[model samples]
Target: PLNGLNGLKAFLETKPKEFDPSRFIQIYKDFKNAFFEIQAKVIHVVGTNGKGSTGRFLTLLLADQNFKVLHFTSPHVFEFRERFFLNGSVVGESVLENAHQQLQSHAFSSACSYFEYATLLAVMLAKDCDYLVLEAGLGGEFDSTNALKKTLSVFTPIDYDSLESIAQTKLKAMGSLSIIAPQQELVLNAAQKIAKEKHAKLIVVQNEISKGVRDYIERYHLARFLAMNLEVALKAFETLLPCNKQEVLKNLKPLNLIGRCELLSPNILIDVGHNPHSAKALKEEIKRIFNAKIILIYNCYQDKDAFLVLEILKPVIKKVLILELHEERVIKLEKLKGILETLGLEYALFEDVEENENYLVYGSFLVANAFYKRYQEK
Candidate 1:
């Protein structure tokens, strides 16, 4: 384990045999042994989608002001260090290695899920920062990230991923105060009920977008969903830094958030979205921005209802290109192709993508990373 980042990553690559929710307590205590007494004011992000976007948005916002900020999200596009960003940059390998060494010194274990070790190690590295933003791996209730005492809880528009009643499950993990972003009635209602029960201070942003925010949205060619995310970030920042300048973003280079509704080239669109909610968003975005449907590159975790995603993208899609993921959890092409057949969608066995035609890779981060790396190198 003292060998460094690669060694630590080797340990992390080991998969947990089971997902017993009861392990949260043990995992929390194990992490607390090394990373307790954090100096940073933690802010936990809980949602089915937009967690990465919002966390990135706030991370850049705060780091632009020269404040020490650390943001953590899951499923890095390129490397493991992409999961732990410190002050507008990915932390160096040495930093991660040092943290991993400390973790080994503490004997953190197989009792912990792979993600729990990542979160705890990230916290250990980020404890010196002024602000720490932690995005939940799944829901907050049983999520290892929920172990910390957060300064505030940030909620994006909640939607079901795999589990039913996702918003309700996520709501139970909020801190004393919450910044509510735009959401469906079902999600908002559940949040309201929780706020009432906990007597927590709730700041619900209205649909009415601000002029500055609107400019950011337009500048980035972002959809209303992204605008709502910026709205939530602004409100949350107002709580923390009342007088900090917000307009600096209009001049600073726009954040290159990978796998948003990210258009890499004229022909390729890559997004690390995997659920029906994200599918709906991407569907509308494609409709608004593109002339017609493009060649769809889709792959998903086995837990997700791939048919649901395919069903939503059916109209905008010209032809489907199913990808086989190398990960342990994925719907093999045999199974996914049958579903595509059942859904009555036209498809082809992908050899190489048609750079001459058009492309959109829309499913898991795995799909996005595969396509992005392939074309990015070219």
Candidate 2:
């Protein structure tokens, strides 16, 4: 059985264009049938950021309570097995090999997308688990992960910038876009209609958590963002699974999602935040967590607003270490530097590090993975 990138590369070679939303009806039905046949208990988590952290939190909590758990999330920071966990650990290679064989034998079709096949394989591997926690790839309505009829649904806060209910100016201030965009309105409206049709309960939460968080924002004078996500997570947990309320709060107290606000060493913290919304959250967390001199190592995807994110991060960071993401989707370092100059932020292009300074590898997930690999090699 293939492992590492080779496995994914092999899988992608035979990938089908079956993921196109329009042509996915029959594929969707088949996938759903496969899922139910396994009779797995599923919990679907959908949102922009925080879904991975929340899913992991829930998985660990449930597992601690003695439930046979299978946790599946996406955008593997390291390995494919990271996307599929059994009993709080990555599924073993032997398990993946057997599951891949099963999926191949099933030979559902020649037209399955990489994501679709991987999702199917995850379901097959977790057949015997008492619970399955799935994180959606995209939006909730039509994403492949939505095929699961979740016993509980978790909606992390939709970035205010991503919501249309608020004013453009407010949205912009919140690091979100205005609600007037025609396409955004269409999507939001469609989501509401679907939720209504399905009778799915929608939980809304406003930012208000521990006093430490609130006071940190006030004292540091950081932007009043990120509080929304914490608020949303709290509310969603309370509403969906009240039985685990005490455990949830207790477990989340030291809630540091790796690569989110990860302190690699004494003076270094690495955060994998790509979007403006995530930038806002990272900024707040940085102010709260670190008080000494800070150096930020950052990069972003080509499609993101590196300038906007840098602007949000500028006030707190003492200096910036700019690098390139290994993937083609990453924005070029030169382009990011130009954006930083335009924002009047002082930054240095990092060639190599001396290992003594307190540095942070911050930006997209790819950037964080690169940093992790480099650190592991050292």
Candidate 3:
């Protein structure tokens, strides 16, 4: 009905009410076959918490070595183009439109969901790259991106989920070799067992921050959890290419992924993290940098455990200002208010930012997106 990228956008907008994985698989296969196979070394990144940052860090590390790399991460905060980072920048609009045009001319392009279509676009766009650092959207084994063969599978720290299911799906999606970051005991055990069963080589990394990386972290003022993710990326880089931590740090581009601990101002910190795992990381980061409790600007989807997330962040929270987001998945204001009341946390609708107080905008991507949309007008 539409043309160019607009047509692709319209097709994605009309996704089925309930996503049928089988339908997605069939459609994906159809489009995937229409194009010649991609030649890039696919680095499939899968985990609960740090997938975006890990994929980004790895992408930049690969790009530092002059490799043509693309990092594909999901739930973009600002623009749809934000999902695809080609080499040093967001893929140009013409490139995105060209990919869309290619996909549109193929069979079954209209049948996939947003994430599925985006995953296919990532493959199409990455046709010329040396490496594609593909971050999973959700459920690792069944995720749309898992359909592609991977050169290396990288695991970021897997946090609490249905821990067993999380470990199972994510670990099962590994290719021939995997570099696993430090994880919870259950996840670690599962990784070892699964690797043994599949005969896949697994390198379980520790949180051993070298003197050089420690210096780099301090210099950049990165959070400890981010430092950990950087450590994992370092390991993955070493495994793939002949590089050391110090050398990689020397070559590393400035880490600049949006909504992952992005500092807007000295007082305003915004993160697109809604789950309990991310809440724990945010709490630790808040404690590390700020002495005083900061006002928490937050909102989450209905399926998120808002109460648990707030409870984990309780110690660092001065007050909560509910960020209003216009999304079908956003939790009801009354229900979120009830949770705040139960937690004994004082909260109100978010309005103007105060210069005197430090603020942490921690919720879903929609919350961060809404914040920018409202403030960018000023």
Candidate 2 local lDDT, 1-378, one digit each (tens): 555544544665677423266434456577556645556667776655567766776676567667788888877665667778887678887888777755564445345677777777778777888888777774335566755556666655344333553222111111110111112454445445545565554443433467744554455443423544444444543454567635344333334344566676766677776767767766766767775546778877776777778788777777887775557777876777788788777788766666666676877777878877876787
Instruction: Write candidate 1's Cα lDDT for 1-378 as tens digits.
Output: 325454686677675523667676676676666457787988888886678878888887787778899999887875678888888888888888888766765555555677877877778888789999989886358888887789988987776453436776788887789998888887788888899899898889888778888887678655524667777887887777878755755764465666667777777778787767667778887887786887898788887888888898888887998776678888777888899899888887665766587777877777878866766666
Clashing residue pairs in candidate 3 are: none
TM values, all candidates:
0.78, 0.68, 0.81
Off by over 4 Å in 1: 1-6, 16-27, 33-36, 161-164, 223-225, 243-249, 261-269, 274-294, 300-319, 324-346, 353-358, 369-378
Segments of candidate 3 deviating more than 4 angstroms: 1-7, 16-19, 243-246, 263-269, 274-295, 300-319, 324-346, 351-359, 372-378
Q: Candidate 1 at residue 197, lDDT?
A: 91
State the C-alpha lDDT per candidate.
Answer: 0.77, 0.62, 0.82
Instruction: Look at candidate 2 and give me any clashing residue pairs.
Output: 161-176, 161-177, 267-358, 302-331
CA error at residue 374 for candidate 1, angstroms: 9.3
Cα lDDT for residue 299, candidate 1: 82
Best of the candidates, TM-score: 3
Q: What is the lDDT of candidate 1?
A: 0.77
lDDT-sorted candidate list, best first? 3, 1, 2
